[PDB]
C-alpha cells in the first residue's frame, strides 16, 4: 500500500506538495478576517475581498512557484518521492442552494485538506466555503492510491449555513476563556489543526475547527486512536502547526506565546517538550498575512532531517543544540498563501507502524 | 445506539419517511432517459398533493403498527447549484431516502451518487443525521464525487453496459440489500465498479459484497430486481434475474420468485415499471407492506406465509419510489449474523 503514515517523523518516502499556480487570495467573510489582530485588519480588509474572486498577483505566484522548486529539488535529494499537485480552475465561481461564493482559494496547503491516518486518507469537513471543492486538484493522486490499496474516506460534507458562524463574534478580553467565530451547528474541522504522533493526535479548537468535528474524528478513529485537545492562547487560532509540532519520539516543539507549558495534557509529561525561541524577525510581503511563529512549520525527513527556513536563524541553531540536523530552505515566499513546509505537504507515505509514544 | 440495523428483515422500530413537498422533475439527461419505460421544473402541485395524501396514510399504517416514523426537513429543491465544471438548473426531491444513504449496523454512509441534480439531497436529511450522531451512530461519506462529463456515456445506446463510466466511484444506496454479513448488490447505470470495490474496502472488516448481473436494461436500484424477506427467503423478479445465474451463496435460501402483475400502473407520468411491486418493506419476518393494486403479489406473499398489510401508493411512484425507496430503517431489533 503506498498510503502508510502514522505521525510526522518517520522515515519520509513520498510526500505531496502543494501548487502556487492559479491561486485566489482568501477570502475576508466569514472566517479569515478573525486571523488578524484588530490592528491588522485595516490593511488586510482592503486587501481581501468579501468572498473570493480575486486572484493572487501573478508576480508572487512567480516567486513563490521558484521557492517551490528548490524546496522539492531538496526533497528529492535527500531521497524523496515528489508528486506535483496540478493546478485546477480556481477562479471558477460555485454555488449550493444556500450560499455562493466568487472563487475557490489554491492548492498551496495539502496539509489543511486531508489527514493521513496510517493507511487511510480522510477528506476534511472545512469550514471555509471557498475551500469547498479544494480536493478536486488531488483526486487523481488520490484515485491512484485507492487502486494500489489505500483506504479513502470523507467526513459529510458540510452545508455551511450562516447558522455555522457567530456574526457577533468579538475577540475575548485578556482575562476571559478563549473563543472562536465557528458555532457548534455541524461538525468542521481542517486537517492542519491536528499533529500526529501513532495511537496519539493532539488537536486544538480554532476558527475553523469545532466540537463536533473533533468529536466526529474521534468517532471515526476510536478503535485505535485517542485524540487530546490543547488549549491555545492565539486569539487568531487556525491550524496547529506553529504551535505544537511532534519532531521525534520524546520530542516536541512549542511556541512559548501560544502555549502555557503548565496546562497541556498530562500525557506529555513523559517528552522533553522543546520551547520555541523568538524569531526577533516579522518577515514581510505585499499582502502581510504572516505571523512570525511560521519558524515552527518545520519538515521532519525523518527523526534527525529537519527542513526549516533560511531566515529563522534562532530555529535553526535550537534545532541543532536539541541534537536534530537542520537543512535550510529560502522559503518566505510562500508565507502569502498561508503555510510554510509542514503546510505545503501531505506526507503520505512514512516507513514505520503504529505505536504508542507515550 | 438509536442507528442498529443489519438487514431488510428484524423487527422494525424506527424509520426515517420520503417527504414530495417541494419535489421538482427529474432530468432526463444524461442518466434518467435510459431509465424510464437539466431540471428546473416542478412537479404539478397536484401531483404533489396526492402523493403527499397517500404518503399520510402509508405513514399512519407504520406508525398503527408501532414504529416510530421521523420526517425529514422541507428544503429549497428549486434552487440552482453548480461546481467549478458544470452547473444544474435545480435539485430533485426528498421521496427515495434509501437511495442517499446506507445503513451499516450503527453506521450511516451518504452515498456517492452519479446523478448531479442529487448532489445536495442529503441536506433534508442533516438536521436527523447529526441528532443521531450525536446519540452514538456513526456517520462516514464516500468521497462526493467530481461528476465531470467523462463519468458519463452521451453516446450510449442499449445493447450487459449502463451509461456511468469509470472515471470515479460513484453508487446509489439502493443498488443494495442487506443481509447481515453478507450484502447484495448491482451495477447499475448509477453504480459503477469502482464504487462497488469502494464499499467493498470500507466495509471489509466484517461484511462481503455479493455483486449480481441484471438483466434490466433500465436498471437503476436493485429493490425491485432482488429483495431478501426474511432469513432464507428471498424475492426475485423473474425478468431481471436469471436464477441459475444467482451468486453461488444464495443455494441455502429459498427463492420466491415474483408474480407477474397482469397491471401497469395508471398515470399522467409514469415513469416506474410495472415491477414496482416488489418494492416491499418488512415490519419483521411476516409483516410486510404492499400495493393494493399487487394482486397477485399480495396472494403469493400469503401463500408464502407472510403477513401482508395492503396500502394504495401508486401517487408517488411518479416519484420514482415505492415502500422501500421512501423510507431508510435506521433501527430494527437486532443484531450482526450470518445467514449462509
Redesign the interface.
Same mark, same amino acid.
Given at each position: 500500500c503506498p498510503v502508510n503514515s502514522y505521525n510526522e517523523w518517520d522515515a519520509l518516502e513520498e510526500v505531496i506538495v502543494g501548487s502556487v499556480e492559479g491561486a485566489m487570495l482568501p477570502a475576508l467573510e466569514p472566517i479569515n478576517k478573525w486571523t488578524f489582530p484588530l490592528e491588522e485588519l485595516a490593511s488586510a480588509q482592503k486587501v481581501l475581498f468579501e468572498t473570493g474572486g480575486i486572484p493572487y498577483p501573478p508576480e508572487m505566484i512567480a516567486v513563490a512557484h521558484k521557492e517551490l522548486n528548490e524546496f522539492i529539488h531538496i526533497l528529492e535529494a535527500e531521497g524523496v518521492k515528489v508528486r506535483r499537485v496540478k493546478p485546477?480552475?480556481?477562479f471558477? *465561481?460555485? *454555488?449550493?442552494?444556500?450560499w455562493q461564493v466568487r472563487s475557490?482559494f489554491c492548492a498551496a496547503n495539502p496539509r489543511d485538506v486531508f489527514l493521513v491516518i496510517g493507511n487511510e486518507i480522510i477528506?476534511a469537513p472545512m469550514a471555509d466555503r471557498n475551500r469547498y471543492?479544494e480536493? @478536486?486538484a488531488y483526486?487523481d493522486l488520490?484515485?491512484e492510491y485507492?487502486q494500489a490499496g489505500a483506504? @479513502?474516506?470523507?467526513?459529510?460534507?458540510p452545508?455551511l449555513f450562516d447558522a455555522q458562524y457567530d456574526f457577533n463574534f468579538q475577540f475575548p478580553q485578556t482575562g476571559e476563556p478563549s473563543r472562536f467565530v465557528v458555532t457548534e451547528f455541524?461538525?468542521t474541522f481542517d486537517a492542519a489543526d491536528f499533529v500526529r504522533c501513532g495511537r496519539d493526535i493532539f488537536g486544538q479548537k480554532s476558527h475553523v475547527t469545532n466540537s463536533?468535528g473533533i468529536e @466526529?474524528l474521534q468517532?471515526?478513529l476510536e478503535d485505535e486512536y485517542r485524540i487530546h485537545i490543547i488549549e491555545s492562547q492565539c486569539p487568531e487560532a487556525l491550524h496547529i502547526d506553529t504551535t505544537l509540532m511532534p519532531l521525534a519520539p520524546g520530542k516536541i516543539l512549542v511556541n512559548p506565546e501560544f502555549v502555557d507549558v503548565n496546562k497541556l495534557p498530562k500525557i506529555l509529561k513523559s517528552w522533553d517538550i522543546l520551547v520555541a525561541p523568538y524569531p526577533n524577525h516579522i518577515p514581510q510581503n505585499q499582502l502581510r498575512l504572516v505571523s512570525e511563529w511560521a519558524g515552527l512549520n518545520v519538515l521532519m525527513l525523518d527523526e534527525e532531517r529537519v527542513i526549516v527556513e533560511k531566515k529563522q536563524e534562532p530555529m535553526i541553531k535550537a534545532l541543532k543544540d536539541w541534537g536534530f540536523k537542520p537543512i535550510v530552505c529560502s522559503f518566505e515566499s510562500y508565507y502569502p498563501f498561508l503555510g510554510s513546509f509542514h503546510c505545503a505537504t501531505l506526507d503520505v507515505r512514512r516507513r514505520g507502524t503504529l505505536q504508542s509514544y507515550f
Open positions: 485546477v480552475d480556481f471558477a *465561481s460555485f *454555488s449550493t442552494p444556500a475557490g477528506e471543492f480536493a @478536486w483526486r488520490l484515485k485507492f483506504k @479513502w474516506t470523507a467526513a459529510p460534507k452545508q455541524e461538525p463536533l @466526529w468517532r471515526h
